[PDB]
Amino acid sequence: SMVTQPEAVDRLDPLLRAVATARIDFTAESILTIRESMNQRRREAAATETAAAGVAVADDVVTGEAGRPVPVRIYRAAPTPAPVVVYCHAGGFALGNLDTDHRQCLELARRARCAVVSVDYRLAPEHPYPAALHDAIEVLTWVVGNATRLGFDARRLAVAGSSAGATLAAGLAHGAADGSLPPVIFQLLHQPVLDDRPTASRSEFRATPAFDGEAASLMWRHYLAGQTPSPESVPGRRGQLAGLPATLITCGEIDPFRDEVLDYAQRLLGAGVSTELHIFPRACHGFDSLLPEWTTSQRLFAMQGHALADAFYP
Template identity: 35%
Template sequence: MSQLVSPRMQARAQSTVLRNVLRLPPSVLRRIAGAPTRIDGQELDLRVQAMLRLQHLTGQTQLSANTTEAARAGMRRGTEVLQGPAITGVDVTGKHVPTSAGGVGARLYQPKGLGQPSTLLVYYHGGGWVLGDLDSHDSVCRFLARHAGVRVLSVDYRLAPEHPFPAAVDDAVESYRYAVEHADELGTSADSIAVGGDSAGGNLAAAVSQYATGSDLKAPVLQVLLYPAVDASTRRRSRELFSDGLLLTDEDMDWFMDHYQPDEEQRGDPRLSVLLADDLTGQPPAYLATAGFDPLRDEGEEYGRRLREAGVPVVARRFDDLVHGFLQFHGIVDRSHEALLEIAGSLRTALALHA
């Protein structure tokens, strides 16, 4: 009988069970989650803690695996469990972005009823440059398109280890250039294109912004950096504080970097460690979000400070009760949903001020 139940059906059933568990009264959830997690003067959201506890009980304790295939399969399963109900009111069109390496896939998300032209957000998904794809961040892109009132072009850049650094950066830059050169076709104008991404995708968005301001390519009007990875050369305090049990682990981070840039001597390249760029003057305005219980927290916030010191307008927001990757479970965790709503609202406001 178990052979008649597909993996997708199993994931949907698990998603339903998880959503129902997380709707239990706080007193019951506390029994599941255990004592409050308090680190560095912060307290982890109860429902996030309960979700992590349940993942631990099922053996799902980290993002990395023995093989990239196993890790990617794990992320696909996790996406199906955590994404929640489908987001409607958005039209989605597949795209092909030509590049010097042969091209990458993309998806254009357009809120129903949105006029032309509108701002376009070129979005790069997270996953440590090794995991993730258009499907893993489909719900996030739909959410941003609908609630921020923008078009979103999600880019399926090449992944490591099959395509190590700087392949992802090259694809990110060429995809942004494509958006600028084909703005009319994408329902926008070259003066109304932003870049954004989460985690590794936030790294790529920052790298694209730096490349554009240092070349003849029109710079983005805004960079949306969501718990970005910005420095592969230095271990900071937050990586020690939140090294285990909070979704992204210290072991995961080593695993990702060993696949993306195995040469440790080259990890200070500013196309990877964007924090180490000599001059950040003239960068696009930035919205930078970090999570309190995230190994990447301190480097992301340091990047925000460096941008400010260079005279760049920055809105920095720490969601101090959340973990790395909180975008991915906005469909089942109320606090994550609230955070993504705030991000979408900030994006809408920033773009309206630009317009």
Template identity: 40%
Template sequence: MAPRPEVAAFLDGPGRALAFPDPPPEIGTAECAELLTRLRAPRPALPPTRSLWQVRDKAIEGPGGALTLRIYASGPPGGVGAAPGHGGGRPLLVYLHGGGWVMGDLAMHDATCRALAALADCVVLSVDYRLAPEHPHPAALDDTLAALAWARANAAALGVDATRIAVGGSSAGGNLAAAVALRMRDEAARAPARATAAPAPPPLAAQLLLYPVLDSRMATASITEFGAGHLLDRAQLAFYWDAYAPLATVDRTAPQLSPAHAATLAGLPPAVVLSAEHDPLRDEAEQYAARLRGDGVRVELRRARGQIHGFLALFQGDPEVERLLARVAADLVRLLG
């Protein structure tokens, strides 16, 4: 299937202005600093796409200093999303933005977070994690875990049900979400018996992986097919990996960097996985979904026909994108109960 007409028009027009230099600069050079400055330049503020009961920022103490969270609440405690017997708390989605671990911010994914909060009738907690290359792995992962721990400790004040917390994100944020799910599963398995100790925190209830990056090998057929001319290209992916996970200091095959390398996915929370047909990352998302299902994890997999990587942010407000967001939100609601 060819790209949707509006996608093709974007690639032939505005998308060209977003193209990376070919080849990308080496990490740490003056050219790299100039590129990062351009990528991180503030974008014009867009009007809110949806009105919510509450949208507010909260600064907490993170591993690297102040960590900003943006809280989106669809309504006061109680309501449609509240589970009987759980104090009227809504589900919570801890959301990690995309941007190759080197760019992106709370504003960039504001529309997506508003949509998920409204459509899933939940609270969304968007995390402004530290960026590479100034803060390489595991900084972003540590910030995510700190945000999750804060959310659990403050569940009552947030009006959420601590037993229905999901983690999710798009692109690099999807990588962080999958990595957090793996880390929490493994830590729970290693924990000693808690006969007299305080009870362990409840496991994650779901994971939401929106066109995630999951495999540092970059060897799938979709990377070969769509690795040039589709906004996100192979050289750009390699730049992101070099910035986030320098080969000299980390093992990129570790599951907390490349979740696709995990020996087993059994015991992970149920997942909603969204891929885009013309995305270099399509195959690793769909292969991960197949592995989850094969290891006994419930999975809702959707492929966005005719779309490219990052389409949720690029084409916000498009009726087809809105319909797909509604389906993804409904999938998440089913998993959260």
């Protein structure tokens, strides 16, 4: 009841305030209930979105050695061979599927003139770290290994994500930098989850609408499942950032993840990584999902499109 009532709503744009009316509950029991309602709503909305965008969409599977595939959704908005982004959706490692960030994927493909391969990674708490990261790696390897047949330019591979999906994208970026994975020329990290260690903004925004600091604590617990955090599970704990791909990193200011975003951006810059950073005013976590037509959400999409397009078409 009162626990669900959100804090800091006065600090949000009135248009966003009208829809950001509830805190999330990120307990395991609540996660099950959210999956059902969120997935039903997003399935319904995704078809309308595809009809409007004019971006070709195809669902496929990357089937693994052990006999179950990782599903993918492939978005194509450029002729073969197209530069390609491997994308991981939001959802705090516990929620979502190919419909969750469908709008974001459509916007990236169209505006950056590229292909996007969105990863339907396995979810916590049932499949904690490193399951989703393994799935993302599997998809990235498949994208590159099959680039000719799929119509991709493997020399122009970017990684991208939102929130917990950006955590996974940052893992792919690290694998490319350390030579464990094929080269990656750009990473796009929208409102990324980066650090299990508490920050001032996590405490300040303990109870903001949509996502908050209390949920962030539960999120890390479900994902780690008792494993000790390390730079491999927690990108913000990586000491040396030199050699990571050029980065676009973005976040709303009324967001528990804001400070870890700022810390990470300063460290990327300090390490000599070319970094574009934006903090969007009067916006909470998930602003572009809550109100995708809002001028601020549109400015985010346009910014992302230009960042990728400049990387892909210098």
